[PDB]
Design a binder for this molecule. Sequence first.
Ligand SMILES: CC(=O)N[C@H]1[C@H]([C@H](O)[C@H](O)CO)O[C@@](OC[C@H]2O[C@@H](O)[C@H](O)[C@@H](O)[C@H]2O)(C(=O)O)C[C@@H]1O
Length: 197
Amino acid sequence: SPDPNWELLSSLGEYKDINLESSNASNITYDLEKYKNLDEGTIVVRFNSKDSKIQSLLGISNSKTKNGYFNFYVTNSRVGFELRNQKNEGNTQNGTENLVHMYKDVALNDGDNTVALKIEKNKGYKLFLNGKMIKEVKDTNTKFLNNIENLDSAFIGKTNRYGQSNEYNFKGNIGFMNIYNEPLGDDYLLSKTGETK
Ligand SMILES: CC(=O)N[C@H]1[C@H]([C@H](O)[C@H](O)CO)O[C@@](OC[C@H]2O[C@@H](O)[C@H](O)[C@@H](O)[C@H]2O)(C(=O)O)C[C@@H]1O
């Protein structure tokens, strides 16, 4: 990754017009090899939710575990992500590491919102929403997808988990999702997310 970061970069993944009105997530597991070893990157999502519960925009997980997952989520009044690893499979809490839970209480538009998560390896994390950098966390030992063992699922609109776990099914539409292998420039993220001030 250069310093400063690129202001415009080709996406690793780009997904559009995902209809989640009946809360049936979009399986993007075919792209999993692109993401599973990432130690940094950027995720940009345009969304409109019809619900107030915790809902995954993007869920990347080890479906053989309860708690081995990355969950980029929203509510009606909050955005954030969790990062958790689990070393033991099946119906158990054993071997769970709760790595990061970063979130911010926010005002959302009633219509479309645009959010971004920026991860800079061993620098930190930033959240953007509707043209603002809403939260920055400095961290000299960052964790991301490469820290979750045996990933096997990637979904837009849910997190694929073992057994009876809460999959955080999203209800509404996702206009777009763009995933990058590098941290993008703040100015790019401010303008891009800013399209839905
Ligand atoms: C983003 C978030 O807060 N994730 C939590 C999650 C949610 O809060 C919950 O699923 C929303 O309904 O809860 C997690 O723990 C589940 C666990 O909670 C205990 O209090 C309860 O006794 C258990 O039966 C079980 O529901 C989850 O894994 O889903 C933790 C996660 O970090």
